[PDB]
């Protein structure tokens, strides 16, 4: 069985990487592009981009360790540890060419270290809607004059005593709808059915825990990145962010300018955090065009 | 009939104020001192201090509207609204003389407006362990290099859709232990027995909801105080804060200087948020000495 519908022309499959069984959905032909999802979601957030991108590229969308249908990591949930799994998976399919990387939300946390450490393996890079873990995250406010803040969940999810699993268990669908909608500008793009699908996936006890372990490792990821960032990113990079409520706005590009020599950015009006759903068409277009400046299938 | 044991020489009683039945515990003789508890607790947090104060003062410790054994407010949960109930309660027992006030945590939120609007009624004031609601609260961080931050719960509790109530219902005892201990330095005063007592009180469905309504009204309280703070407090005041894990540290006094002409502050080493239990001896001494500078029973 499958947690989410696989698009026509794609296949759902698994590969062992360092003893961890990773799930992914793959299709297309040409140079490889790996698409990495974030919190609350799975490979499926890319399902609208995939068929279009597959016309020019081989496209692989893995489930992060412990999430979707992927086994939990055996090393840990820090960015440097998880990035090893994703880098090695990519290299199984693109051993002889650099590959493209597109990441959203904690997909950024889980890829940055392998990108900065293996730059010859990366052709082009697209990051959307999340900070690279660094000291900037300590500046976000706990509370705002309009109500709940953007990232109070960093503390909720990082808390010990399995605080988040214990409170959210039995209310997974309820919590996820609140979380997604509170970070969206356009809530209409999230049908009750789509929310059902995402909730049933992350509600698996090992996936609910895995979800929060990424946050319990966040401070460690920040410390790792303080050393990694001594090396600038040299590949062509594009950032995307939502310009509406729930989005990162100008933060995304402004941070990336400190990390990357060659970066361009866009802020998408009318969209919040969930770009692939809230801003499917413009996001897809910007990604496809940016990656198509490099060698691809015609 | 009692959620918590009433100290010898005290009485548990009720008084209707503006159509709301408030519970309180009262004893002693001399000038009136009102002690006002905060979130996660009830009048009982004061039970060690009460007998000592009762030697020199008439002591009243009410349950905040909706918490402990007090009915919810009929007007609202903003500071100015709740302060009316507490001011009127005190003035029913001290109608012709000023009274002293000691407040902890949201007890501060729920008393500040009546103090500034009725300065002549307040002889001396002790505030401990919480910000007065103002724009400073928007500067606290969502997340720290040492994990969960002090006030991320402001957003959690203030969130729409009854998020906090829905998640915490059925898990109240677990949640309160984590919340209290995460804000404590001397965690071990919170025995399983004591936590059971506090948890069963706030687990009453109307009390769980009431708890969070104070946070849902926080931004309104900030807006109210912006007008009220045009007038500095002129009575002798003392602030206390914990200097250990979970405490407000130097923030308490520094903020209070903006509000009061005559203020002394103390930061208590090895103590977090829960001063009456974590650091009973030094806190009780500081309070007794400070209030005893004024008129009192000998």
What does this structure look like?
Two copies of one chain form a homodimer. The first copy, chain A, has 298 residues and is of the alpha/beta class. Chain A has one domain (9-292): Alpha/Beta hydrolase fold, catalytic domain (Rossmann fold). Helix content of chain A is 38%, strand content 19%. Chain A is built from 13 helices and ten strands. An eight-stranded mixed β-sheet of chain A has the order 1-2-4-3-5-6-9-10, sandwiched between helices. In chain A, a hairpin with a 2-residue loop joins strand 7 (143-144) and strand 8. In chain A, helix 7 (172-182) packs across helix 8. The longest helix of chain A has 15 residues, at 79-93. Chain A binds chain B through residues 135, 137-152, 154-156, 158-161, 163, 166-168, 170-171, 174-175, 178, 182, 218-219, 222, and chain B through 135, 137-152, 154-156, 158-161, 163, 166-168, 170-171, 174-175, 178, 182, 218-219, 222. It is classed as hydrolase.
């Amino acid at each position: 069985a499958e947690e989410f519908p696989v698009p026509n022309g794609f296949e759902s499959a698994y590969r062992e990487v360092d003893g961890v069984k990773l799930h992914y959905v793959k299709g297309g032909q040409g140079p490889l592009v790996m698409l990495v999802h974030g919190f609350g979601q799975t490979w499926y957030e890319w399902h609208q981009l995939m068929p279009e991108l597959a016309k020019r590229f081989t496209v692989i969308a893995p489930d992060l360790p412990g999430l979707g249908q992927s086994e939990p990591p055996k090393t840990g949930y820090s960015g440097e540890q998880v990035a090893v799994y994703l880098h090695k998976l990519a290299r199984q399919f693109s051993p002889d060419r650099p590959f493209d990387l597109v990441a959203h939300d904690i997909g950024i946390w889980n890829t940055y270290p392998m990108v900065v450490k293996n730059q010859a393996d990366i052709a082009r890079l697209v990051y959307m809607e999340a900070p690279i873990p660094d000291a900037r995250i300590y500046r976000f406010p706990a509370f705002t004059a309009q109500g709940e803040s953007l990232v109070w969940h960093f503390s909720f999810f990082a808390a010990d005593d399995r605080l988040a699993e214990t409170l959210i268990a039995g209310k997974e669908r309820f919590f996820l709808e609140h979380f997604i909608k509170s970070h969206a500008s356009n809530t209409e793009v999230f049908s009750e059915r789509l929310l059902d699908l995402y909730a049933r996936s992350y509600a698996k006890p090992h996936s609910l825990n895995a979800s929060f372990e990424y946050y319990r490792a966040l401070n460690e990821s920040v410390r790792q990145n303080a050393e990694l960032a001594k090396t600038r990113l040299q590949m062509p990079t594009m950032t995307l962010a939502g310009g509406g409520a729930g989005g990162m706005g100008t933060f995304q590009l402004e941070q990336m300018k400190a990390y990357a020599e060659d970066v361009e950015g866009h802020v998408l009006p009318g969209c919040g955090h969930w770009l692939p759903e809230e801003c499917a068409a413009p996001m897809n277009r910007l990604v496809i065009d940016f990656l198509s400046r490099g060698r691809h299938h015609h």
